[PDB]
Design a protein around this ligand. Structure first.
Ligand SMILES: *C/C=C(C)/C=C/C=C(C)/C=C/C1=C(C)CCCC1(C)C
Length: 226
């Protein structure tokens, strides 16, 4: 019964409830466009629910040696984010009608971000763990640059309702995503300053906010209608 399980149980519950609500509401809408957003967003919550559940049950956890200790690394997180982060970017891209090349470059950068992030979380040479972390953060900053400079401009061709909805989602995304590299840096994966139970609480608040929070804002808006 690890100290962080209570936060994993609360995360499972919140992701589960969000998944159900998104599923029920999406199943009733007939609009084709509205449906796309509902399917993507419900999938994002569903994947998070399953991974929180797996971790709650003892999976996705491995001891990596470094800094003279056996460090508890929850790798199930990257299995979640590998698929949920680019899906969230997809929601945003579809909202502003971004083009093919942009989406591909964004998803590719997102793949690098999660990939190098996991390599770093598994690296046994302490200093190198931060080399990988640095590359992952640079990848994330590219994504945030594109969402802020590129997309916002693209939402210029949209109607107030949609441009308005994108800004809120963009703002929530930029604030939440920018927090992840800091939590990693000071937590179990990096400096080991913040204990795993508190770190798990921090990631749970961020995850739930970035998926269920983002989802509620997105799905209740009129901008999802084609
Ligand atoms: C539902 C999950 C979301 C929206 C997750 C977002 C996760 C990030 C923006 C993660 C970023 C990371 C870095 C910038 C570097 C270190 C490792 C990561 C993967 C924690």
């Amino acid at each position: 019964g690890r100290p962080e399980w209570i936060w994993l149980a609360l995360g499972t519950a919140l992701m589960g409830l969000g998944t159900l609500y998104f599923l029920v509401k999406g199943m009733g809408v007939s609009d084709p466009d509205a449906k796309k957003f509902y399917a993507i967003t419900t999938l994002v919550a569903a994947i998070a629910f399953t991974m929180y559940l797996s971790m709650l049950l003892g999976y996705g956890l491995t001891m990596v040696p470094f800094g003279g200790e056996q460090n508890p690394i929850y790798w199930a997180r990257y299995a979640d984010w590998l698929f949920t982060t680019p899906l969230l970017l997809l929601d945003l891209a579809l909202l502003v009608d971004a083009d093919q090349g942009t989406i591909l470059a964004l998803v590719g950068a997102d793949g690098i971000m999660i990939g190098t992030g996991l390599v770093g979380a598994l690296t046994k040479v302490y200093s190198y763990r931060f080399v990988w972390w640095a590359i992952s953060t640079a990848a994330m900053l590219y994504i945030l640059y594109v969402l802020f400079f590129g997309f916002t401009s693209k939402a210029e061709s949209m109607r107030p309702e949609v441009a308005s909805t994108f800004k809120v989602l963009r703002n929530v995304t930029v604030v939440l995503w920018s927090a992840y590299p800091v939590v990693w840096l000071i937590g179990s994966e990096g400096a080991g300053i913040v204990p795993l139970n508190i770190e798990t609480l921090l990631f749970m608040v961020l995850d739930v906010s970035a998926k269920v929070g983002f989802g509620l804002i997105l799905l209740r808006s009129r901008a999802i209608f084609g």
